[PDB]
Amino acid sequence: VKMSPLPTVENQFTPTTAWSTSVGSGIGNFYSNLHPALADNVVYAADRAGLVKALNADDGKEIWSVSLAEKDGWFSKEPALLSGGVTVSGGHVYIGSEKAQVYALNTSDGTVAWQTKVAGEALSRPVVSDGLVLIHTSNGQLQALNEADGAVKWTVNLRGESAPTTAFGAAVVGGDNGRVSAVLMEQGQMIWQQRISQDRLSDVDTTPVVVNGVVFALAYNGNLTALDLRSGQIMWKRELGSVNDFIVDGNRIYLVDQNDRVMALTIDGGVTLWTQSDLLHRLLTSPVLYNGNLVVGDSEGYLHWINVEDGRFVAQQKVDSSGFQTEPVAADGKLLIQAKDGTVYSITR
């Protein structure tokens, strides 16, 4: 109901915007999981309409760009509805769309290496492993495409993102029905399935996270479960409260629930170390670790920096008026985030 006010923070440091660069019209008022990718000092980002850009990671200046708008149809130009991604790997930029297409672009010049029709809407980021691009579709399919030519090697029938995760030769996918699946990457052979379950604030990221032989996954209802990677056997479940996003680091789980409470939990999920509720109903992005702090954005376009030991705020900063939604990205010493209007920011502690 009530969005919390902007907390009063005594900054312990003063984070600023290193640069910003627009990317078309971004995602607008639509829900999306589209976010930036970073590789070898180049930022790759897109908008829903079909514009993809490659940018210098130091100053945000465009290196290349391409419009994936479908100009083959009744109207001379139709939106691509880019939705899942961006993912970069092995000289390719991969992006999925609500129109059941997956694009592979060359990192060198933005040109289309290949485009493949997939079995359903691709709303989740491509995940690349073992020479295959894994695509979890919105209608319960997992397809593996060859990185080289985008051919569908195998298909396995099984709001919110649900990308696959990979570990030791297997893919693990969460999903709508409340089942988590493990599938061998070679030929998509099913190894095991496990049921982990069985409304307006519900935006659950059901992407599994695999850490040292444990699969941590959220159910469609927001319950967090831990399963043994190899067997799918359930190790523990927190039927407490409803979680939207989480990350794992060391012996800790950091999460943001449907009310926008931020928490730290022990890795066995048996204990809440702390809860920070000062951002209640501010509609937070998923969290990320940067410079040792937990960072989240909100729908009003502020970034909040949180101490992982006690949950207190250490810094705050206004960034973009269109507001944040998709995930911040922390990689190669950089912090990147894309606002709803499409504008991509680099943030410096």
Domain ranges of the chain: 1-349
Q: How many CB atoms are closer than 10 A to CB 278?
A: 19
Gap between the Cα atoms of 144 and 160, Å rounded: 21
**Does residue 255 contact residue 267 with C-beta atoms inside 8 Å?**
no
Residue position matching structure tokens 């499409």: 342
Gap between the Cα atoms of 101 and 85, Å rounded: 12
Q: How many CB atoms are closer than 10 A to CB 44?
A: 26
The candidate with the shortest Cα–Cα distance to 229, out of 194, 257, 274, 261, is 194
Instruction: Return all residues near 324 (Cβ < 8 A) that are at least 6 apart.
Output: 285, 297, 298, 299, 301, 303, 337, 338, 339, 340
**Does residue 337 contact residue 7 with C-beta atoms inside 8 Å?**
no
Gap between the Cα atoms of 252 and 238, Å rounded: 14
**Does residue 59 contact residue 97 with C-beta atoms inside 8 Å?**
no
Instruction: Return all residues near 20 (Cβ < 8 A) that are at least 6 apart.
Output: 60, 320, 343, 344, 345, 346
**Does residue 217 contact residue 174 with C-beta atoms inside 8 Å?**
yes
Task: List the determination method.
Answer: X-ray
**CA angle 287–291–292, rounded 5-degree value:** 70
Strand 165-167 and strand 170-173: the pairing is: antiparallel
- In 168-311, which ranges are E strands? 170-173, 179-184, 190-195, 209-211, 214-218, 224-228, 234-238, 243-249, 252-257, 262-266, 272-276, 288-290, 293-297, 302-307
**Does residue 197 contact residue 219 with C-beta atoms inside 8 Å?**
yes
Q: In what order do the strands lie in the sheet with 302-307?
A: 288-290, 293-297, 302-307, 313-318
Alpha carbon of 209 to those of 160, 170, 217, 218, 299: distances in Å? 15, 13, 6, 9, 25
Gap between the Cα atoms of 30 and 106, Å rounded: 28
**Does residue 337 contact residue 328 with C-beta atoms inside 8 Å?**
yes
Gap between the Cα atoms of 303 and 211, Å rounded: 27
User: DSSP readout, 115-163?
Assistant: EEE-SS---S--EEETTEEEEE-TTSEEEEEETTT--EEEEEE------
Here the tokens at position 29 are 């008022």
Here the tokens at position 58 are 């130091």
Task: Give the type of residue at 61.
Answer: K
**Does residue 224 contact residue 247 with C-beta atoms inside 8 Å?**
no
